[PDB]
Ligand binder design. Sequence first.
Ligand SMILES: [Zn+2]
Lengths: 73, 303, 313
Amino acid sequence: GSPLDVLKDERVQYWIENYRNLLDAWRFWHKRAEFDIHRSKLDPSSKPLAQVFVSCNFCGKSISYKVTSCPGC
Amino acid sequence: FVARSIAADHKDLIHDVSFDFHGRRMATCSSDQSVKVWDKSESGDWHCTASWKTHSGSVWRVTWAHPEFGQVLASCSFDRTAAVWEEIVQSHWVKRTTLVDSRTSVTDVKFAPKHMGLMLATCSADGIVRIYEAPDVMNLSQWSLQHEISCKLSCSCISWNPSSSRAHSPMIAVGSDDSSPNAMAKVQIFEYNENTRKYAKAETLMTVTDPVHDIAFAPNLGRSFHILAIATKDVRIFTLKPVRGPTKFEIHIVAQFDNHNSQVWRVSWNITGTVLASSGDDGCVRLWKANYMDNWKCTGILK
Amino acid sequence: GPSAFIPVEEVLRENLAVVMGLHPDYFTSFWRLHYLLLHTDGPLASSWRHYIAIMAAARHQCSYLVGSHMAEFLQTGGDPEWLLGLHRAPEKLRKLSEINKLLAHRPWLITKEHIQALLKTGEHTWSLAELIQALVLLTHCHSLSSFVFGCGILPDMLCFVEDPTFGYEDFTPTFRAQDYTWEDHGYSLIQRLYPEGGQLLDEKFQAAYSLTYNTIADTSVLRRAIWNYIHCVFGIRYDDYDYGEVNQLLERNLKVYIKTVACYPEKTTRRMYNLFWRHFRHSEKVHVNLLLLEARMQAALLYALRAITRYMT
Ligand SMILES: [Zn+2]
């Protein structure tokens, strides 16, 4: 239950990031995943991981939202 | 062999049943203007999955298309039309097109082999057969008409040749039905002529005079010639060897089976194409196989 | 302002789409028809439909529909090279120009021989389902081209036409009216070859035929007059109507205006617009200049369906 001013602090994010890293050291992957679900549902400011998206060869754009047909062109 | 009766829950005669590519699904149609799809279950049970209305006339032959193009069906009915129904994701089947060109009722519709794209052929009662094509594969609504042939007689059945080689040009068989006492042939062979890009006249079975009621080509799988089947009042099997305009053929007769003492309605081959099936007005199903010396003999009677 | 013919203050008190918004029902019906015709998937491709719209709008020199339509044809996978001219177009639409002639200038010469030559075997053939869409598209675009100039709406071509000096002839084998009517005969045929198109055309036709006229000295008599007069311009003669009321129920200014709009829409001017019925409100002059496209489309569809029906009989 934090209003969106405390969570923006540079201190309140460092503790979460460092706890997540400590959980990485434990190799407690699934516990970290559950904690990420918790943090994401209780903190809109957090932006999830940046990963790969695949792109078409003719349209050139992303496919992420006929099923077989691309949605671009 | 054993049988498992299935509750049709139809309101009229069932005309055809066709199997899926992978053998787990089968589609039914009837003169009650409907199409139903049944899928097998874990305990080998059959149950219905879709019971939607398709046409406004008696629905005849219904076929499956290769799942490389998706789960797309086709049908013909007393309405002088032809449909390309498709299933989309609960799931339901939605129409894609309606080919309305014939002045008389369309009798049979058969998909082409895969190796020539997505095609569809329909024979009309007045004697015109026509080939369609869908160059844009992902939208089954841009259908085009490519060829039109005149058969000078009523058309009842159609059958494609599944020979996948590039030494065999595509060919299509036309089954007539006229009973007028004027003799004349019924079955005719049409062969693609890629030199001129048109279907020609290849051969005509002169020894067939009684009405032809169903036709079928045998799967090849490696055979160097062509085997044909005809559902007349008897069951006949033909063999066609191309000699090295259209190609010249050699037409021989292999089987002259007449132990149905009835009128033979349907014919159906296997996957490996070594055993045949047929049903007649007597009411049972026969199976025929070769005794390794071009000497066919009955191998079962299912009733 | 959208138009230089209607005052901006009048439009505000009451890019060309906002003009038609003063009528709710017809705006909705026309938008539904446009959406099904040009955007939904069907027998033809989207690029070909936009090209058909282009060739059917480049007939009345409507430099508004030959615009956006070519501006959205390019963004749909179209070939940029095609706009060089019909000489660059594939030998599949070249059979359509001869029938595009009379569907915009002189409808009465259509017959079986024209549709037959269109449905002719060879290396480029149409089917029924893929030419009935084309003719409905052509009629819709002609009607829009007439209406846009009918409101004078403010926002190359000659290389897209064959013999561009054709024009419309005054007139004088007439078409008898209640021998082949839409509500009985044509509706069944269009529905059989094109189910959804028939229903949308039907809704459009009754929606346009339920609009009132308010200011009148019985807002039905002038409606019937302005509805049958444009029909007898094209050749359909209703025997029941007494045609004295046609001249006795519409000022000569109204007659010259409606003929100028429906025949040579490029000829209308602000003086031509204002010279008739200055004592009214512009929606009254819109509901009249807006039914003429409907009557034109009805007559064109009836003639085309009479031409096609004979080909099967
Ligand atoms: Zn793409």
